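Exercise 7b. Backbone tokens:
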């Protein structure tokens, strides 16, 4: 359900996690 891990999931997408 999270095709955009880089954004959705933080642990996976630290970029968006900030």
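Sequence design result:
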């Amino acid at each position: 359900v999270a095709r955009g891990w880089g954004r959705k999931c933080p642990l996976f997408g630290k970029n968006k996690s900030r």
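Instructor comment: The helical segments are 14-17. The two ends are 21 Å apart (CA to CA).
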